[PDB]
DNA sequence: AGGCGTCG
DNA sequence: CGACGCC
């Protein structure tokens, strides 16, 4: 990295402005700035000169100038300090936590883990399965352990019907080393557009892959969607391996690269792919990518019988799921 | 950007 | 329903 120092700085002061302040245009103006910052090719000197960076303007120079004169910044270094901050941004590690949630936890007098597991009667099921796991939910999984859950999980899918199709997208899919979570796309026949909405085709999954004794726990569980938690099997006379998070979505069989589109790119990729889409005229969703009107109003979608076709619609360049970050 | 599911 | 917290 050639000015590491300013991004790093910037996005701490990014989190702490929304996890802590809830300043929501102050996280994203720190955000907009950290990657136009990241992408400038020069080794920034000054303030001034980072201040002509668009998504730069006269606070974040001042930073940047104080950051550059005195290896430090005086702002970050109290919020390190600052118990009530450390605690808050700690406590969005759990899952089902986030900045609200926190905030009211520390205002409780609640500020650690242990605290936490001291009054689980003010958590909810969600945050509270976080609490359960939040060492696990931290390791990150390797490669192979995101095949050996695909087998799993592909292996039972059809045991139940054959007609299922699953896709374990997510950062998987791009070609990751390790995985946060394993995102599973689901479809099947009885699924589509002209369907009347079957919350059964997702429910007989998860059932199955519960009664296997994979899926453990439940955070959501919808029609579409189902959040959870999943477990590789305890070979015996070993340790068991760590209990993962699993996401599985169920997209209509007639809008399925919608769903892999959504599912696999990035989640910050998706943010400027689907922008460049109203820049087109055009509006994707991960079941539909419908055209935006000639004053505003989306119509009926646009057929699509590949992620291809989609990046045709707005007149970009196919990105092979790889290059998506 | 854009949406699903939960809590009260 | 709106706020949340998440993907
Ligand atoms: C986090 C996030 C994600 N996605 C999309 C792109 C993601 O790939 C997919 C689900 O995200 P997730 O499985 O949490 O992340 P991953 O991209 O699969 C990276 P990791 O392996 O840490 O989960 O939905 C979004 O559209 N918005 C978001 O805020
Ligand atoms: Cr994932």
Same mark, same amino acid.
């Given at each position: 990295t050639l000015n $590491? $120092? /300013?991004t790093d700085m910037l996005v701490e002061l990014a989190n702490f402005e929304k996890n802590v302040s809830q300043a929501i245009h102050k996280y994203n103006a720190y955000r907009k700035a950290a990657s136009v910052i990241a992408k400038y090719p020069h080794k920034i000197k000054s303030g001034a000169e980072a201040k002509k960076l668009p998504g730069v303007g006269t606070k974040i120079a001042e930073k940047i100038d104080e950051f550059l004169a005195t290896g430090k910044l005086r702002k970050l270094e109290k919020i390190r300090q600052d118990d009530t901050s450390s605690s808050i941004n700690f406590l969005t590690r759990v899952t089902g936590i986030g900045p609200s949630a926190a905030r009211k936890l520390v205002d409780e007098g /609640?500020?650690? #883990?242990?605290? #936490? =597991?001291?009054n689980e009667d003010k958590l909810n099921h969600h945050q509270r399965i976080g609490l359960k796991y939040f060492e696990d939910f931290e390791k990150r999984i390797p490669r192979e352990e995101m095949l050996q859950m695909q087998d799993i999980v592909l292996n039972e899918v059809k045991k139940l019907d054959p007609e299922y199709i699953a896709t374990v997208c997510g950062s998987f899919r791009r070609g990751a080393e390790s995985s946060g979570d394993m995102d599973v796309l689901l479809t099947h026949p009885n699924f589509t557009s002209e369907s009347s909405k079957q919350p059964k085709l997702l429910h007989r999954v998860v059932e199955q892959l519960?009664?296997? =004794?994979? /899926?453990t726990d439940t955070l959501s569980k919808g029609e579409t969607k189902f959040m959870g938690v999943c477990q590789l099997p305890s070979e015996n006379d070993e340790n068991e391996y760590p209990h993962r998070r699993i996401d599985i979505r169920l997209i209509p069989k007639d809008q399925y690269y919608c769903g892999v589109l959504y599912f696999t790119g990035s989640d910050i990729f998706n943010k400027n792919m689907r922008a460049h889409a109203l820049e087109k005229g055009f509006t994707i969703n991960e079941y539909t990518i419908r055209p935006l009107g000639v004053t505003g109003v989306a119509g009926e979608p646009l057929p699509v019988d590949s992620e291809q076709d989609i990046f045709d619609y707005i007149q970009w360049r196919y990105r092979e799921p790889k290059d998506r970050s």
């Open positions: $590491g $120092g /300013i /609640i500020k650690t #883990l242990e605290d #936490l =597991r001291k519960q009664k296997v =004794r994979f /899926i």
